C-alpha cells in the first residue's frame, strides 16, 4: 500500500478510548486553551505499540498518509449525524473527538483557521442538504477535487487528519502522490519554478461561515490572496522527492504563461490518472501527509436519514511557530489581515 | 530572564538519570539507527513535570532558550575531559549523552552533518591545545563569536541543545535576540530582503574533520557554499517577531550592495550591544531557539590538565523531511554534492 497502516489490538483499542473519555470528563472542550496545551503530554499514555508506530512512521520516506484502524464506535452512543458542522458538537461525538486531538498530538501542533467552520481547531466533515454540488467538504454528489489542503497559505498543515465517526456505504477519501515516474524534466523544472497561482478556497468564504464571524478582520487576508495571489511554485524540495502544493479547483497558471500552464495542465492528467482510493471505515483514523499528497473525495448520493458519513477533521503542523504572522490573537487559529 | 527555566528536583534528576542509564546499558551507542528512532518514545517516561515543561515551553512566543537545571554528573565518575573531540565519547560520559538525546526526543528529530566531527549526532565542545585562536567551537582563548548555528544552511536546526559535562570556572555561553527595539524600519525591510551571503563556518572544513572522511563527496556542497553562496536574507517571517540567520564571521553582504552592507553593520553594532550570558554549570542543560537567537562562547583560559569546561551537543529540526535533499544516504547525516 502506499501509506503506512496500524490496526489497534481491541485491548489497545479500548485503552486509547478509555484515555479519550477520561478526558473529555476532566476538560470543557477540545479547543479549549488547556487541553490544547495538555493533549501531546497526556497522549504520552497512549497504548506503547502507537506511539512507537507514529513515531516511526511518520520519519518514513514513503507513505502518503499515517492509517489507524480499529477505534470501536457505537452508533447508538454516538447518535444521528448531525445537519450541518454548527450543531455537529454532539455529545456522541465528544470522547472521539477527544480522541482525535490525542493521536494529532503525537505528530505535531494542532491548529485552525479563523476563516474556516467559525475557526474551530477540530472541525466537521458531513454532508449538507442544499450544499451538494459545492466545493466544500459538506458537498456530496459532486466529487470533492484533489487538493493540497488549504494550498493557497505558506501556513498550510503538514498533515490533516480525519477520524471516520460512520462511513456506513464506504465513501472513499481519494489520494494520489507526485506522478514522479511521468513527469518529463522540463515539465518539472516549470513545476518548481513560482509561476502558478494558487487561491484560497471556498470554506474560506464569509458564507461559509456562521453570520457572528463575517465580522472577522481575517477575512481581509483571504479576499487579498484570492484577488491578488502571488506566483509560487507547485514543486519544492528534493527533485527525487518534490513536495506539492496544488489544488485542481483553485490553481492557475501565472497570468498569460503558456509554458507554466502547459505544466499544470500536464499534472493535472497525471494526478487524475494516479487517484486511489482509501476507504475510512467507522472508527478509521488518517493522517494525510500534506506535503507528499493531495486528497479528495469520492462523489456520493446522501442519506439525510441521520446517519450520513461523518468525519472529524484537524490540521496538524510539525511548528506553530512558523505562522506567528497569522496568530490571530490566538497562537492556534489563523489568519491576516 | 530572556530564557524559560525549569529546575529538576533530585528525585526528578535522579529518574531522568536513571532511564538514560537503562537506555545506555540497552543501546550500543547514541546515534545508532535503533536509539535515534526509540529515544523520542523513551523520553514519554521521563518526569511528568518536565515533560509539561518541554511542550509548553517550546510553544512560547517568547523564549530565547529552555534550560534544565540540575542534573547530577560525579566528576570521578565522568572522568577526564578529552583533548579531542574524537576520543569523547568516554563511558564516564555516555549516560549523559543518552540524556541529552532523550531531553532532544521531546523537542524534535535529531541529527548531524556529513562534513561535521565526522557526521556524529551527538558532538563534543570541548578546549582543543593548540586550537585556541580558532573560529570553531573547540576554541578557547579567542571568544567564539555569536551566531545562527549552521548559518549557510536552509536545513540548519531549529535547536541546539547543550550540556554541560564540566565548566568548573563558569564560562559563558552567549545569546542574542532580534534587537528589535533599536532597527529602523528602513533597516529592517533590507535585512527581510534576499541581499546577504552566508558561508558555511570552519567546523565544515575537511581539516577540521578526521583524516578518514575527508572523504566524503557532501564536503563537495560545502565547498559549493563557500565559493558561491546564494543571497539570502537575514530576518524572515514576521515583522513584530522575525527570525533570524546570520553569523558574525561568516556573513557577508550581497556584492558591492552598500545599503545591505549598511544594514548588517547595524545589525552588528546592535548583537554587539545586546549580548548577555547564560552559564552552563555541570549537569545543566540548554536548548537554544536557533531562529529567535544568536549565541557563542566567551573568550576563556584553557586549563588542559583534565578537568577543562566540556559540553555535549546535539542539532534538532521540527521536521527531518524538510531536509531530504540532504539525506546523505543517511537522513540523521546531512549534506550534499
Ligand atoms: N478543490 C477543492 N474543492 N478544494 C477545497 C477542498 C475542501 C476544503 N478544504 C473544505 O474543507 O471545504
Ligand atoms: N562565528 C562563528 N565562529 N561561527 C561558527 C560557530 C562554531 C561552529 N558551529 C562549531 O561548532 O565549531
Given at each position: 500500500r502506499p501509506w503506512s497502516e496500524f490496526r489497534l489490538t481491541p485491548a489497545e483499542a479500548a485503552a486509547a478510548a478509555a484515555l479519550a473519555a477520561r478526558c473529555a470528563q476532566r476538560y470543557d472542550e477540545t479547543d479549549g486553551?488547556?487541553?490544547?496545551?495538555?493533549?501531546?503530554?497526556?497522549?504520552?499514555?497512549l497504548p506503547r505499540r502507537l506511539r512507537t508506530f507514529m513515531a516511526?512512521?511518520?520519519?518514513?520516506?514513503?507513505?502518503?498518509?499515517?492509517?489507524?484502524?480499529?477505534?470501536?464506535?457505537?452508533?447508538?452512543?454516538?447518535?444521528s449525524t448531525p445537519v450541518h458542522w454548527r450543531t455537529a458538537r454532539t455529545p456522541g461525538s465528544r470522547p472521539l473527538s477527544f480522541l482525535l486531538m490525542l493521536?494529532?498530538?503525537?505528530?505535531?501542533?494542532?491548529?485552525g483557521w479563523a476563516t474556516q467552520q467559525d475557526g474551530r481547531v477540530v472541525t466537521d466533515v458531513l454532508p449538507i442538504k442544499g450544499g451538494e454540488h459545492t466545493l466544500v467538504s459538506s458537498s456530496s454528489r459532486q466529487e470533492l477535487g484533489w487538493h493540497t489542503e488549504d494550498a493557497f497559505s505558506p501556513y498550510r498543515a503538514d498533515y490533516v487528519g480525519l477520524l471516520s465517526l460512520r462511513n456506513?456505504?464506504?465513501?472513499?477519501?481519494?489520494?494520489?502522490?507526485?506522478?514522479?515516474?511521468?513527469?518529463?524534466?522540463?515539465?518539472?523544472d516549470v513545476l518548481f519554478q513560482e509561476r502558478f497561482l494558487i487561491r484560497p478556497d471556498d470554506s474560506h468564504?464569509?458564507?461559509?461561515?456562521?453570520?457572528?464571524?463575517?465580522?472577522?478582520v481575517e477575512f481581509e487576508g483571504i479576499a487579498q490572496a484570492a484577488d491578488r495571489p502571488e506566483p509560487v511554485?507547485?514543486?519544492?524540495?528534493?527533485?527525487?522527492?518534490?513536495?506539492?502544493?496544488?489544488?485542481?479547483?483553485f490553481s492557475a497558471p501565472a497570468e498569460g504563461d503558456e509554458?507554466?500552464?502547459?505544466?499544470?495542465?500536464?499534472?493535472?492528467?497525471?494526478?487524475?490518472?494516479?487517484?486511489?482510493?482509501?476507504?475510512?471505515?467507522?472508527?478509521?483514523?488518517?493522517?494525510?501527509?500534506?506535503?507528499?499528497?493531495?486528497?479528495?473525495?469520492?462523489?456520493?448520493?446522501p442519506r439525510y436519514d441521520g446517519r450520513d458519513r461523518w468525519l472529524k477533521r484537524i490540521n496538524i503542523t510539525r511548528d506553530l511557530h512558523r505562522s506567528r504572522k497569522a496568530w490571530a490573537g490566538d497562537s492556534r487559529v489563523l489568519g491576516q489581515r
Open positions: 486553551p488547556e487541553f490544547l496545551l495538555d493533549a501531546p503530554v497526556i497522549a504520552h499514555e516511526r512512521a511518520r520519519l518514513d520516506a514513503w507513505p502518503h498518509a499515517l492509517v489507524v484502524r480499529g477505534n470501536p464506535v457505537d452508533d447508538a452512543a454516538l447518535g493521536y494529532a498530538g503525537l505528530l505535531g501542533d494542532v491548529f456506513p456505504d464506504g465513501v472513499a477519501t481519494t489520494l494520489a502522490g507526485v506522478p514522479l515516474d511521468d513527469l518529463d524534466e522540463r515539465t518539472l468564504l464569509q458564507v461559509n461561515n456562521s453570520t457572528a464571524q463575517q465580522g472577522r511554485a507547485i514543486l519544492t524540495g528534493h527533485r527525487a522527492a518534490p513536495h506539492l502544493r496544488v489544488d485542481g479547483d509554458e507554466a500552464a502547459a505544466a499544470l495542465g500536464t499534472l493535472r492528467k497525471l494526478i487524475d490518472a494516479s487517484l486511489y482510493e482509501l476507504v475510512l471505515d467507522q472508527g478509521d483514523v488518517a493522517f494525510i501527509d500534506n506535503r507528499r499528497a493531495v486528497h479528495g473525495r469520492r462523489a456520493f448520493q
